[PDB]
Amino acid sequence: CKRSGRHRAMVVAKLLEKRQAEIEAERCGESEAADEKGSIASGSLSAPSAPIFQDVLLQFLDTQAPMLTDPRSESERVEFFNLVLLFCELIRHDVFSHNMYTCTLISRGDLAFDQPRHVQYATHFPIPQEESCSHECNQRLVVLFGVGKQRDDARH
Amino acid sequence: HLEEHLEKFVENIRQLGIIVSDFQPSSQAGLNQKLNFIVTGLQDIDKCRQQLHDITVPLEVFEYIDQGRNPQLYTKECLERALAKNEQVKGKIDTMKKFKSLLIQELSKVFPEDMAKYRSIR
Amino acid sequence: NELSVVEAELLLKSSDLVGSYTTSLCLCIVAVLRHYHACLILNQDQMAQVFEGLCGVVKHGMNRSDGSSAERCILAYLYDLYTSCSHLKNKFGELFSDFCSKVKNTIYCNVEPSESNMRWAPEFMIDTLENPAAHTFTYTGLGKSLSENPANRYSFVCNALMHVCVGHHDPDRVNDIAILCAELTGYCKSLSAEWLGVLKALCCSSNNGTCGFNDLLCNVDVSDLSFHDSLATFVAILIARQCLLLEDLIRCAAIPSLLNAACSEQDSEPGARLTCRILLHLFKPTVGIRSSCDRHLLAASQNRIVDGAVFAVLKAVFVLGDAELKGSGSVETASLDVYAKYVLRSICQQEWVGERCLKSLCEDSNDLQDPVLSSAQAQRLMQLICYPHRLLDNEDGENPQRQRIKRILQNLDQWTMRQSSLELQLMIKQTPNNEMNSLLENIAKATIEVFQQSAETGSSPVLSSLERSGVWLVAPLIAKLPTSVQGHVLKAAGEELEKGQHLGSSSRKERDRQKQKSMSLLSQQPFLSLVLTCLKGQDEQREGLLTSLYSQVHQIVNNWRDPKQLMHEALKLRL
Secondary structure (H helix, E strand, O other): OOOOOOHHHHHHHHOOOOOOOOOOHHHHHHHHHOOOOHHHHHHHOHHHHOOOOOOOOHHHOOOOOOOOOOOOOHHHHHHHHHHHHHHHHHHHOOOOOHHHHHHHHHHHHHOOOOOOHHHHHHHHOOOOOOOOOHHHHHHHHHHOOOOOOOHHHHHO | OHHHHHHHHHHHHHHHHHHHHHOOOOOOOHHHHHHHHHHHHHHHHHHHHHHHHOOOOOOHHHHHHHHOOOHHHHHHHHHHHHHHHHHHHHHHHHHHHHHHHHHHHHHHHHOHHHHHHHHHHO | OOHHHHHHHOOOOOOOOOOOHHHHHHHHHHHHHHHOHHHHHHOOOHHHHHHHHHHHHOOOOOOOOOOOHHHHHHHHHHHHHHHOOOOHHHHOOOOOHHHHHHHHHHHOOOOOOOOOOOOOOOOOOHHHHOOOOOOOOOHHHHHHHHHHOHHHHHHHHHHHHHHHHHOOOOHHHHHHHHHHHHHHHOOOOOOOOOOOOHHHHOOOOOOOOOOOOOHHHHOOOOOOOOOHHHHHHHHHHHHOOOOOOOOOHHHHHHHHHHHHHHOOOOOOHHHHHHHHHHHHOOOOOOOOOOOOOHHHHHHHHHHHOOOOOHHHHHHHHHHHOOOOOOOOOOOOOOOHHHHHHHHHHHHHHOHHHHHHHHHHHHHOHHHHOOOOOOHHHHHHHHHHHHOOOOOOOOOOOOOHHHHHHHHHHHOOOOOOHHHHHHHHHHHHHHOOOOOHHHHHHHHHHHHHHHHHHHHHHHHOOOHHHHHOOOHHHHHHHHHHOOHHHHHHHHHHHHHHHHHHHHOOOOOOOHHHHHHHHHHHHHHOHHHHHHHHOOOOOOOOOOOOOHHHHHHHHHHHHHHOOOOOOOHHHHHHOOO
16 A cells, blocks of 8 residues: 555566466476376376466465455555455466366355455456356356345346 | 246255365355255245146257257257248249249140130139 | 558548547547556567557658647657667667657757747737637647747737636636647647746746746736636646656746745745646646546656656755745635645655655665755655655754654554665765764664663564564664664663673562563574674674673573473574
């Protein structure tokens, strides 16, 4: 909130969209050749299912928001304003492991049950990946907000 | 109708329970089993409602949706074959029309008297 | 980028939209793209087509020399992307060599301006100035009249200032008369060199002859302070097309108005207020434009200017708040001393100004090298730069510099790292060469209470535990300080370890609790981290801190005769 300018916000996403897939992929192919050790490694098959990628960095950022949904306090508003666009451009450039980024918020969404912050997270995070797949984008937006068809009028 | 909504809620509850059981369920994981049982009960109620409806379905659409075929495209081939056979019989009828046209003019040019008599007769 | 194919396709259909819809609304695309130039210039693949796309649209305009302002400003932005990237020099370097001389000849009208003494008539060229609100005036022929005689531009300026003040102050009408003023000024090549008087005579109202062209003061009122909101917006659109250069704007406008701001009586104290308003909105009822791009043209046009004038702006703001005024007359009827201070705080209330100044002082301390400021008056000045919404601090004591140190160290965090460290490093050059001992005792008593407050925080995640433990933070701040500071505090850290044993006078009850605190100071790894950086570059600092290691090693060999191995690492740290 002290220093600002979203030219910095574009840099950190673009410092890390290509670095997460070009220095770990050198060691991923080393792991891709030596990942067949019995039934346990065959039962997992982590490397051939998806390349090894930098992950679980989302858990450093979900803790630092007790009620970060308001403009009544001026410093944390631009903190929250930067927070959602930074979360947007990680999805835009595919910076993060979005295969497991989605599943953690599914697990946080499922095990959640003035609203709690994990409900505040998935409601207000902007995903720019549109018309990709209905089984990943469209069906995720429906099930994350309970039961009730009054949300279709705002869709209208 | 309400059966489709019950089936959609059943699928949503099953997906939510699958995602919860896949992760480490810290709370009462019996709520997921209760949701699955409620989904099964809603499916049974939808089956009873459809039994009151008495709706019939053939089995070919089952392997079409096994391939993943939308019902709209099955209706596409249905309307397509209907219009194609309609065009085929229409073309056959039109060829029959021009054939009897050459018949009428040939019978006129070689046999004028009886053709004129039948024209009087109809 | 692909309007060039649309322009090529619709050239044969030949509507009125050729050169108009793909160029005037292109500037709206240009204005947003200039405002986010930093995002486009960052990645070097998408922008390569942008310079290719912008060239192909205006490929019938590489050889312009007498074009319109909107035609020039987009090609100025074409020059802006070319100048801000060396990799654009390679692929379209062949079509820039002819493009370089024709574009820059419009901008290179840098000369001493015309000092002609024509007897100013307040009626010259009355045909356009009678009612310019109507669209009956064709704007291609108006630029021909301004080009043939330079005095037409002078008289157009004089009477338009009468219309904005006498007429109704609607924000929509003044935008339209500013648009025609912006396009006609940029219609010809050398219309930017004749602006020498109006940039001074609109504000300098107590000279009467040094500026010339006395009709500027004559035909309009001065004491009215309502139409200058429209005037500041009018020159903001005017400067957004680069019609006002900055190589001689200081010689024309700024420094004549600096002497007439602080050193003026009520004859130009509203004129001193006019100095404030033309510079407050230069970089930051109301003129509410419907176009959101027009509210963001000045932020887009600010990329070509630098921090070489903001310190000169804030220089005269202090002196306007320094020379006391009593004849004023609560926004403007009060004194301009506090109103200059209102400008001083509201400039740094903008979050852009605070970060841009602090990075500049981290680059070089020559931004605030002016010796016009006093000691304590400059001390509060960078505290506005440090924080805009801060309280005004108390008056000076015997040690005014020491009290400025103690306030910033009571509230230490990671976010105020550099502005605290900037406050220290300005203080070692503002202290003259006769009294570094005055600064040495200033860093004596203020840093021993740091040693007490590091002990006081010790007595009573990572980042949340970091900000409560700013003794972790002050050592890199000490690490920025020169070697005289660390050598001096080793004397200060030496003496507090000397008194640690000597307090209590070897008591059965009073020494042991003090000796408990003395070995506690050994226990906190801040205290070793404070001094391990200090052991580099010291000549006489052996005897001070080792007095603590005298009595601490003596008691533990008697305490050893009595958590099995926790003391072993407590013995490795003294090694």
